Amino acid sequence: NQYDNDVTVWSPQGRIHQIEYAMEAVKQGSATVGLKSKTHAVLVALKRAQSELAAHQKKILHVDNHIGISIAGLTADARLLCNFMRQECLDSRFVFDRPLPVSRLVSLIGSKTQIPTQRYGRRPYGVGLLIAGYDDMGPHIFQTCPSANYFDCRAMSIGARSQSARTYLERHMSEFMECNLNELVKHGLRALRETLPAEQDLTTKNVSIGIVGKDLEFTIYDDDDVSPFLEGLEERP
Amino acid sequence: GYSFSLTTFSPSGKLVQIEYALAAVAGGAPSVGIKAANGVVLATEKKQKSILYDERSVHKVEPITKHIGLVYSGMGPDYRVLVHRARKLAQQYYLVYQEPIPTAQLVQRVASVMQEYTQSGGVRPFGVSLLICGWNEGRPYLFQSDPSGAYFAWKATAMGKNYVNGKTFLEKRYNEDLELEDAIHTAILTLKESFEGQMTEDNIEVGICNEAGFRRLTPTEVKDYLAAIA
Amino acid sequence: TTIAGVVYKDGIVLGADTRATEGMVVADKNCSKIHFISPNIYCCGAGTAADTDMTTQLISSNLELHSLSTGRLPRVVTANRMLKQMLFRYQGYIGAALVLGGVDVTGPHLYSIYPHGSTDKLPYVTMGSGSLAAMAVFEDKFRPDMEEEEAKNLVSEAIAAGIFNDLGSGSNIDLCVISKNKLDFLRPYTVPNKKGTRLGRYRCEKGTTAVLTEKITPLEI
Amino acid sequence: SEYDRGVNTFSPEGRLFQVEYAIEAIKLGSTAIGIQTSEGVCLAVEKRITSPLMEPSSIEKIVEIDAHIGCAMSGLIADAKTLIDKARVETQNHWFTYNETMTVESVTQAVSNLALQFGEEDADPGAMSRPFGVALLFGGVDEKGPQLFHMDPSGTFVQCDARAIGSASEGAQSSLQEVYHKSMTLKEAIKSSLIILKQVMEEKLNATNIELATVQPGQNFHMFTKEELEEVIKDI
Amino acid sequence: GSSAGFDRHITIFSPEGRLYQVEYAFKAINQGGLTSVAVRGKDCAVIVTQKKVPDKLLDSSTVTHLFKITENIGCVMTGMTADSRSQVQRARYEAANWKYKYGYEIPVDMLCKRIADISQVYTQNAEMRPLGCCMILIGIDEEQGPQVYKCDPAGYYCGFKATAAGVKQTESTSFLEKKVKKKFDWTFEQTVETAITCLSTVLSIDFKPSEIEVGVVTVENPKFRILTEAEIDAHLVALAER
Amino acid sequence: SIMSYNGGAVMAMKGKNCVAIAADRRFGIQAQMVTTDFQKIFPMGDRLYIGLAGLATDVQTVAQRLKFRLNLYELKEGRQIKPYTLMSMVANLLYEKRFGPYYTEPVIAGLDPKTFKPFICSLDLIGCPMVTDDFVVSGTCAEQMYGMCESLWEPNMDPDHLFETISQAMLNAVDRDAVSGMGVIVHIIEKDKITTRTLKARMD
Amino acid sequence: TTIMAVQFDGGVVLGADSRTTTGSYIANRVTDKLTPIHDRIFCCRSGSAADTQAVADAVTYQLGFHSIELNEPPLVHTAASLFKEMCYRYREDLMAGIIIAGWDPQEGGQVYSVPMGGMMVRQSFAIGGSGSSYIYGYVDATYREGMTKEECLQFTANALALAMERDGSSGGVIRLAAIAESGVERQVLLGDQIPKFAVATL
Amino acid sequence: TGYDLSASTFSPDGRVFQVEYAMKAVENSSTAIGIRCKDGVVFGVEKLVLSKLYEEGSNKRLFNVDRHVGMAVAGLLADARSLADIAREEASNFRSNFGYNIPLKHLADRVAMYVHAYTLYSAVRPFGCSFMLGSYSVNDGAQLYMIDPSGVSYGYWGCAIGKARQAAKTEIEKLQMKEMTCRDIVKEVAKIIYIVHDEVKDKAFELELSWVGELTNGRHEIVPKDIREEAEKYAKESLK
């Protein structure tokens, strides 16, 4: 095919095949869920690595006291974007002495990601992002796609077999707004459990949690810290 | 821009883009140049397609300096580019050495410019060949510069359509003791050898170099010469 | 230096002196301060000699390029624009003071151009160290629409006033008459000063100078 | 043809072609093994000696990044020299600015940032044209204890307990699965790694065709000499 | 009509010395379906163009191919609309810069030469394509009179007594050739009549004032003028009463 | 003055079908003499010479750059340079350094390579050419040389009388300047020979 | 130098002296310090002759291009803004005090002052130059609202003559321009046309 | 043959196929509509909701380019956002240089030139978006321009971009919009949007409305919620 090797080539159908191929990278990756109540925002990540000796790869990253991100796809691209976001927040604090609003950060990310899709010899960013944040307008969950399109979500799952998680979330989304923190985290954990093959279960090893809220800096609960949340979770159907 | 050459070597050792540029030159309007004892004559055919064309607008015979003149065969826009380059080069030489530039020096500099386009990135050669006339040190000079960047010194030569027949005609009719008027007659005869229709003062263009300098003949003078020829 | 210019009924008269000094010593006695720009435009230069020379040569080359491109006779306003933009670019570090005179399709034009890029379009102008002495003659005797001989006499008188009253001006008087039909470049036009005759012969005879070494090299013809 | 695709082209499956091909280059190299214990980190590699005329002492598959960090390399060994120089410069700049030692994770991250910095256009002169064909094992001791990290050409770095890289990785990894427990002593780790290396090597393991290094708390980076190597080899 | 290599895809030579991309750019002018005629007279220059508004939802003011380059130079563009606008912007910049640098208004022939020089670069450099537009310029020169110049995507520029551009260029050229051979030094009315008659005859359309655009320049009023609908209707009723 | 740091005097004079160029020989740092055989006249052709006065470092620099340019010109053109063309070349070289000037002033003396017509010219610090039919001088003792040359020069002198005139002028002028002297060298350029002479001078 | 501009209902009146000085010598005695920037927009230049000429030429170029692209007559405020941008950007390098006066269909007749430093202020009348100092009290005492074109011309001529009497850097002839919708009218006052004021004698 | 792989290549018949493929990208998008009356401009977008997990206000297709200028886009949303930033920068620069609010025709010309610069080279790809600019001022009146991926900008009385453009144009031609008020136009815009929507293929959608006119003091803004809900009621009634 002569239309599928460059990002500057339109197909006769009106598509760019390189961007779709880059979205495939996000579809292959491990699954993550994000949800928000009226006060908090939660990111639940399914950590995994190649072998048991190999510690589960890091999926939830700290960007700022009010912003954290979850990753799906190419990890080096994710670190590039993470460094860009950290620098933007730092510049906002240096110049205006205030935190950067989350929506403006997602706008800056979208601007950064669109440029490579229009120039010869460049490639998209093969990374899908889930952003959890808190600012003056409340808690926010944002989704970022390799096509440079971004979405403001009530809840969202990305990764492999994440359609089942999205189905679960759609069924239960009316409850989330009125939940407390443990209930919200348990909802996210149930959605994430929906992606595992029927034999696998949720352990303290393969689960990472990230929480932000009105009076809590972004916290990453991994290992023993997640045992309080995994407690009281009924078995799968 | 493109950083790579579009002219490369073929297995037989040829630079085929230069040969295709020469093919473009061989399809152009005929040009003739003759070196007399007291001057040089450059003559070309400008046969417009319609009466709607205003003949005083564009000229194929151009002055470069007071004593240097140019004519071409091939593609006109490229000719304009080369004319601008040549005029700038002559002005730079005058600014440095306070002397009008010798014809050979101008030919060498312009040929360097033409060579650059056979090796630079992202460009094609010039599809034009040039005849250059000058008067230096009480002596007339006539030169030819081709798309490759090579220059030759001629007593008489022809370019463009039917240039081989013009060359044979000039071989049979050229003489060392020619004076400029005889040379002008001979050049018009060479152009007549390959002309379709009636030659008038508006479908040919003549220029001459002598001790006074280079000048383009007015249509009246060409009509006088054409009446003499006929 | 004394340079001057007037407009008369049919054109332009420019005038200059021929002395060049290095400090308070006379270096050249036959300098030409009237420079060629185009067959219809000429310039008189004052200030730093090298700056004047190079600036006028550069603008003349640029105008020849322009005239070859357009096929038309150059215009004095084009020279004016080129010169003043170039001089403004250098913030007065090119020390050229110029009198620019030409005749084009719009008529006779005369300009005064200052080293910082300031231009004045006037019917008579003077520049140099002897400018005020020439301007006195102009302000006393100038009339609009003079004949060629009256204008020549007036410019000659102004240059002579600069010569005899300024220490930086002297020697001969050079003139340039520009009309639409002709150009007259008159070097020299008048000679007001000559060198007195010598009264002694300073014994010039062979063998007066003592030599230590000598080498003769033959050259081939 | 080779130049139909650019170097920054995705596959229909969502993978960068050049990275996949470099990972395939990783499979052609020598076998390196790294084991992490509470007493320190052990790194063992095989020298692939092709001729008896080659002097084995000029084969450096294990290098010292700093007194607390060492590296084992597999694949295209010439490519690894740039990364190692970057790592050394990073550790020394960190000491200069902060008057302390770098953590193994930070060094690994700094080296992994260079991995995907390749392209043709929109890149500065002196930029890379292709990926790196090396896999790296970093072993060190910091305030978190003994740390072992793995890096592949994709830029991905992970923390591992035991890990094999190179041509015989799959079988060696299975053996490491069988023999690794959290309560191992460094002597046991050294012996187990040498047993596995002997199993996978096509030659016979003697004291000149392998390399072993350790990093322990309190003791610096140590490359085993031939005599200590013979002492360990006697038990196997 | 042979080929070898990428000679049909980039601006390089074919075995016969041709540039196929320039010929394809000429084909691009006919995409648009419009025709323009320019005629020169004793003291006047006239450009007449076809105006088509397919939508009643279009604002008819903004659909125009007559443009003003300076106060005294006018143009009609034929071909791809965006390319045409790009060339108009380039021409305006060049004329303004000429006035700034040399101190007098740019001649029409020099402006056409500059535009054609810019177009030549696109036929020599391989990373850009030519523009699919033709430009016709009219003006008054205070030494030569009315001026009508045309430039094409190849880099050719010329001055004309009368010319046409667009889909029906050949038929219009024939009509104008016959008219110019029987020479009458044309008055302003005769020039406008000739242009409008050529367009009508070649298109086989009886025009309504809204179907054409007329732009004039005269020695008495040297400023480029666009004719209103009333003036066009006056000319059309005079043409019909013939 | 930075010109007077090393001293030096050069002079050129015009005859009938001949030219003469003379220079002093001292090299010194201010008041101290270092050598007495410093070259200030360089050949730019068989019948063309250039003399440089001023700062000795710039003298050597300008001579070497000028030879660079002249050699390239003569290779490209296949001809020998005319004296006026060399004047223009030197003026261009000096004006390229307008705001970082070379501290040298040149004189050029030669015969036209075809018609064998005398040519002398002088250039100042930045390159304003001065062409004369009598004589040109340059250096720290310019006023002294001007007086001697104005008093002694006559038109249409044969080579011997030209030698006597220029020798007397240079000797008597440098005898009144402290940082110039320690010998004089003269070149007489004719159609068929070059004659180089060293003069008996004061060494104080 | 003395430059002045006064606004009346439906237009403006500008006026200037005609002296150029290089120290105490008058280089030009009939100079024109009023420059047409556009058809109905003029500037009065004060300060460095070269600097003001260069700035005026650049603004004329930019404004002509802008007017061609927009197909509208330009606004006086736009010309004042271009002058302000150039004078503020190069304020360390330029000595230029400008007055911009004009008429546009939207706002009528307008007068803007751009002093040295590059600030821009709209005034009902503006005065500038070295001689402007001597007529500040006179313009404050004599200015009244609702003047006609003829009264504005008389007022400007009186002020300029008073300034030229007391300033050694001002003098020559008086140049006046009236700008309205119908166009521009220019006048020269010389000799006995210049208003005279009796000198005190004992 | 590969006559359609670069924007610097003509086809033998004189077409640049890459720009045509970008236009195909625009034709797949949902429909945006703009209607102009003597006192203002109204913009309406059919915004498809691809999941119920998305918030209200996600993927806005209506932008504020200047305080007096609004933008309605169709096609690739990332390209549209980059173009919106280009237009904002153009307006800011115009205010900083010339000192007043940019005229809409000038802004449209500048943005159209920027878009055209991407249709000439092999090094860049054409934009896959089309958009409408709308403005009001007292001097200039009410202006509505449309720009397509080739760089053509035209002024309109009513314009439609996207998948159902022809049917929407048919509906817009039934209005005597010159003698209508902005209040009536909002209801008519909503009605047309509800008419052209295909419930079978496209599941659910929001109505995005905005306007600029003397009613808003020449400020572009979202239509207030009560007016929007009243118009939606009118539109749903009209569909029976």
Ligand SMILES: *C(=O)[C@]1([C@@H](O)[C@@H]2C=CCCC2)NC(=O)[C@@H]2CCO[C@@]21C
């Ligand atoms: C004249 O201004 C003057 C001359 O050198 C003159 C300058 C320009 C053209 C060449 C000759 N310039 C000077 O520096 C001296 C001082 C006074 O007048 C000079 C002779």
Ligand SMILES: *C(=O)[C@]1([C@@H](O)[C@@H]2C=CCCC2)NC(=O)[C@@H]2CCO[C@@]21C
């Ligand atoms: C006026 O300010 C003045 C004028 O020379 C100058 C002339 C041209 C137009 C701008 C103004 N500038 C000056 O430097 C002198 C000194 C005081 O006033 C001047 C005459």
